[PDB]
Amino acid sequence: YDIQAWKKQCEELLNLIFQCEDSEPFRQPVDLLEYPDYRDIIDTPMDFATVRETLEAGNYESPMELCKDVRLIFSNSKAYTPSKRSRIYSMSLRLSAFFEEHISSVLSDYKSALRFHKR
């Protein structure tokens, strides 16, 4: 029932993601010189460094907010890819499966803690 425990849990999950080779294309904003049409397709860029900095600045109020920004990394990849068989898209699909497997208990525990506080 610790209402604050989600923040260190999210820090530790981001550490795991940064050690995974599949995260390398997504660690920093997409290079607009390498991909000059990116902003013709993608309205809101997102990357894992931006998520970690937002967390460390104290600008997420809940893990739901962090989870929305991480899911935007993956939806951007699915919208920008020219093929379902692209290398970088394949990497995002594996990394999304790993993230969803690990974020499930962080969300559950937070929502349980809030319900206990309200009881």
Ligand SMILES: NC(=O)c1cccc2c1OCCO2
């Ligand atoms: N196939 C790709 O080039 C691509 C495919 C999916 C996501 C991307 C991609 O390139 C820029 C970074 O984000």
